[PDB]
Amino acid sequence: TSKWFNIDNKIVDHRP
Amino acid sequence: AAKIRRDDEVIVLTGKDKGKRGKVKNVLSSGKVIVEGINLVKKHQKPVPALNQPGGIVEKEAAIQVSNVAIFNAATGKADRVGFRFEDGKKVRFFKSNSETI
Amino acid sequence: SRVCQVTGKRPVTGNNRSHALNATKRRFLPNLHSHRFWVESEKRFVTLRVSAKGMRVIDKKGIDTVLAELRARGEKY
Amino acid sequence: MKAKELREKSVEELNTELLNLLREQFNLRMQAASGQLQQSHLLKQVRRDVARVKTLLNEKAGA
Amino acid sequence: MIREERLLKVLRAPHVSEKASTAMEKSNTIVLKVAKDATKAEIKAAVQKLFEVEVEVVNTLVVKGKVKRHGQRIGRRSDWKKAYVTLKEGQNL
Amino acid sequence: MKRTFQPSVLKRNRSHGFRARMATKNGRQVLARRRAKGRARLTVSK
RNA sequence: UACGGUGCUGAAGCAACAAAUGCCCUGCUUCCAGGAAAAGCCUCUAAGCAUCAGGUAACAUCAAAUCGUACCCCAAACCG
RNA sequence: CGAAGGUGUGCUGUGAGGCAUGCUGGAGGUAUCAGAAGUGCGAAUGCUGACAUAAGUAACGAUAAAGCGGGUGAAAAGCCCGCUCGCCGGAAGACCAAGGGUUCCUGUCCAACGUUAAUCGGGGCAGGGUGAGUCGACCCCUAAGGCGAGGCCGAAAGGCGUAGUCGAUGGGAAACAGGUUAAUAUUCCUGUACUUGGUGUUACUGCGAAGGGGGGACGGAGAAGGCUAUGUUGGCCGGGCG
RNA sequence: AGGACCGAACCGACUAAUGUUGAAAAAUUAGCGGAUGACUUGUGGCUGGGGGUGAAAGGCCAAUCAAACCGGGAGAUAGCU
RNA sequence: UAAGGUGAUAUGAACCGUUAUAACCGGCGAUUUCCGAAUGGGGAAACCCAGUGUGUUUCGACACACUAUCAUUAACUGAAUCCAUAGGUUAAUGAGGCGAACCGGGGGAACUGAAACAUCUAAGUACCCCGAGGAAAAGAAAUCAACCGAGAUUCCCCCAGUAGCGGCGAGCGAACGGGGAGCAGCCCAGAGCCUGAAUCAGUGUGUGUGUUAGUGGAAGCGUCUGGAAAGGCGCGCGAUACAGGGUGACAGCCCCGUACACAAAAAUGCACAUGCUGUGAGCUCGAUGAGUAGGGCGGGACACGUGGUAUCCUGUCUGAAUAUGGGGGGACCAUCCUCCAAGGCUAAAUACUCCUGACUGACCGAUAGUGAACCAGUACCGUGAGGGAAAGGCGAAAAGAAC
Ligand SMILES: N[C@@H](Cc1c[nH]c2ccccc12)C(=O)O
Ligand SMILES: [Mg+2]
Ligand SMILES: [Mg+2]
Ligand SMILES: [Mg+2]
Ligand SMILES: [Mg+2]
Ligand SMILES: [Mg+2]
Ligand SMILES: [Mg+2]
Ligand SMILES: [Mg+2]
Ligand SMILES: [Mg+2]
Ligand SMILES: [Mg+2]
Ligand SMILES: [Mg+2]
Ligand SMILES: [Mg+2]
Ligand SMILES: [Mg+2]
Ligand SMILES: [Mg+2]
Ligand SMILES: [Mg+2]
Ligand SMILES: [Mg+2]
Ligand SMILES: [Mg+2]
Ligand SMILES: [Mg+2]
């Protein structure tokens, strides 16, 4: 499946 | 029917006994035959006290093919092919080449 | 089922068409009614689920004929 | 063993019938299972014999 | 009678096996593999007729086949019935 | 935690068993396909 | 005792006090939100049977089939 | 008297290649000129398999905890026995239902499974083991709900529903204390019981429904009294004189 | 008497640290809320995919949800990589 | 048919057979648990429980047989209601479920194409459903033609990507006529006489011919290399047989076959020939398919999108003429010509292959070829529908390694 950090929004969204 | 059959005396045509005569011991539905004193293989068999067997190497005869033997004519003294004729409602085998019923 | 016991009329599918000719499936289904019919020839009423026309046939051919049919054909009734 | 009893009488046969079971078959199982019966082929026939028994009798009466 | 003589092929084998069998010999009763459809009463009869002994009462239980061996696929044994028969008194065999 | 499979044979048979399968035109087509496929367990029953 | 166990024998076996969330209690008191069904059981007769058959009791006797019964079960035996 | 394939070597062509031959291999291969295409791979986070790497690194799953002696054994921190020590004790003890389905017991083996060793195991192999009128299912009875002769409805498939018929999570007859197996036991054994039908005997009698009525038959909270389990002490009994 | 009070079982999931190739695809430890009620629980039943259910978050409908899963149309179409 | 057999992994045990009751092959029988349309009721498929009949020199309880539903027919019964119906019991028949495609019928998508999207397309496709046959359907002009003529239906090649249709876009797309395959025509709408006379099906027999086991079937030796000859070399021989497989390396002559010639106790497909059942033939004189044709409204079919749109079908409301009559000839009218609707049947040329037999391939050769060369729809995954693998080769011979 996918690692938790990839699914998680705060770490992943990082630069909008 | 079958050309080479059970209690027959035959002469080998091919390979390692080529030319060795012998009597057919039995004939196996693989299309093979076991013939006495023709093919000898030294099997290694463990000695058994219960069966009172000495053990060590023993000599026996392996199954050769039916097509590797042909039955010995003994009137010509050579190998000979077999046919089937009818005599008095009996399907008998006969030697080819002198046409003699076996 | 919505089948006319006299004519065998049953619902048939066709289309709607708008002024822009948009096709939308639809059904035309028959003008059924179910009606107490006097036979006299059996001193009894029989309710046939019948179409108008089914009636107009019964008017013309006359009941008993129509009842020969149905029975000829096996219709319960 | 077939026509040997094609002609052996419907009533008479039901006798050997039992005699196959009544004796051979039951005694054989017991004796066998208990490690006696050295000649197993007796189990093959007997069973096959009863089959013959019942083939006639069925074909003699009614069929 | 009640059970045809034919159908007294319900007795299938003695279960002379384990002290369970023999230590429950030495204190009445004998035990046996017996049919599958056999009806306690039906198997008492067999033991009366054949074996010609007396029988107080018979208990039954079903043994379930052990499943075993094999690599991918698997093999199972047959189920079968146990006897435990309990003879009245002048006890013999 | 409590997971999704909570086994129970009564429910199993009632929901997926032979007879249940048999009680509906489509349930029957279920079997038909499995037979044509040559399946060894039509419906996981006793 | 083959050191895991296994046999044999065998005393007293009363009283006082305390005491449940168990039982009496499907009770009792009270309240509103007003608290399954059907059979077994008891009784009533209809058609029907009236010496019969049935019904009740005592004693005697016979029947009670079949299928489950190992083991884990807050877990190393189940869902993970 | 050694085909294809594999592995070297020499030569040759501008190249894709070709020829020769040693070794391996052990049975097929095909010039030439034509003919036909599953005709050429390094990449597509391509597909399948095999094998690297990080690396003999992290880790070996509750910080309830181990020490020693003696057995067995090729080998004992881990198995067996013993003496200490420590941990749970409304459980980390005990009986089940559900679910599993031989994991139970006994011999035997240790390759693989066990996050180590393993003589040990819920692991391999073989044999054994589940005993019922009374426990439970089946069974009678129904709830929810399901199915549903006819029937009403629906283009077909089908939908709903009456009579019914199914469906327990609830109602319905009856066995207890003790013993015994390596392994079951309210089932086996000893003692002592009970339930409902059939049949018979003997008395005495209106019996009789898929029907009527009764009963079964029912909520929440609260309050004590009476009582048992159960405990404590004394007495009693056996043993002790540290 | 009570959607009454303090507080175990039981039901919850406010804070923190740990864990994040976990012991664990959502738990551990210490604290925390409810705990005779709109409580909590075993068994069994009914509701089906533009449909269900929803003390309402687009929540949940088998680790899947702004339209479940399986098979099919099917080699959808891809002016893009 | 037979000298050897008791299926395979698979030895072993105990057997069976050799001149005909070993085995093996074929025809026809017999037995044929339980579940499953499941059919006595129930049910969590392979289980629980019955009513009624039978059954016991040990006539209890168990075992067996039968009892579903619907249809048709008959019989007997029989309400409100007396008649009569509905209702109810029994009985005889038939149905039911499964199955690859081809076939007819009831329903019927969207992706997509139009470089967007509604009309249009994809397409009457996919899919669901019902039904049937060996084929299905269609079919004996109310058809075309164009003043000359043709003469049922079906299929093939043309006509032609033409004429046309068409947001006249994308696309869709005939017919006339011609060449071919195969050709076949009959009943009802009815009574009289004569009567079972043609014919069709169902069926028994016969015969022939195919089928389901079978039989015979030619001719090679020497030597060299080698573990082994079928290979090389030599010399013979058969060929209506040089198809193919096997055998220790490549065999016309070792084996099994092949060409060729033969064979059926039994059961069957197909033809004829008849028997039995059911059925009608024949002549005279009649009859000639109305809620239909047409029309109005709404749709659908025709290549044809309503268009100037003939023609066909009908949900809806209507509604003729009847041989001096009526349909069609692509709006429509006249004339001409041509056909007879509103009842049916009908073989062949055409379609298809779950399966049987034989034969073939410039088809694959274990990541290929079926998912499956192998005990594969398996192991495994999933509540389920459902998904779904990997895995072939010792040798000529096990001689599979005693000690
Ligand atoms: N357990 C994770 C949290 C987590 C689990 N699944 C996730 C999916 C998406 C984001 C976060 C998570 C953690 O270490 O915090
Ligand atoms: Mg039992
Ligand atoms: Mg137990
Ligand atoms: Mg090659
Ligand atoms: Mg590559
Ligand atoms: Mg490149
Ligand atoms: Mg490192
Ligand atoms: Mg380090
Ligand atoms: Mg470490
Ligand atoms: Mg096991
Ligand atoms: Mg154990
Ligand atoms: Mg290890
Ligand atoms: Mg074990
Ligand atoms: Mg009930
Ligand atoms: Mg119905
Ligand atoms: Mg219903
Ligand atoms: Mg219950
Ligand atoms: Mg125990």
Ligand SMILES: [Mg+2]
């Ligand atoms: Mg009495």
Ligand SMILES: [Mg+2]
């Ligand atoms: Mg009452």
Ligand SMILES: [Mg+2]
């Ligand atoms: Mg007390």
Ligand SMILES: [Mg+2]
């Ligand atoms: Mg002192």
Ligand SMILES: [Mg+2]
């Ligand atoms: Mg409170």
Ligand SMILES: [Mg+2]
């Ligand atoms: Mg509190």
Ligand SMILES: [Mg+2]
């Ligand atoms: Mg979820």
Ligand SMILES: [Mg+2]
């Ligand atoms: Mg694509």
Ligand SMILES: [Mg+2]
């Ligand atoms: Mg498409």
Ligand SMILES: [Mg+2]
């Ligand atoms: Mg049944």
Ligand SMILES: [Mg+2]
């Ligand atoms: Mg039934």
Ligand SMILES: [Mg+2]
């Ligand atoms: Mg588009």
Ligand SMILES: [Mg+2]
């Ligand atoms: Mg003319």
Ligand SMILES: [Mg+2]
């Ligand atoms: Mg021959």
Ligand SMILES: [Mg+2]
């Ligand atoms: Mg020959």
Ligand SMILES: [Mg+2]
């Ligand atoms: Mg006419």
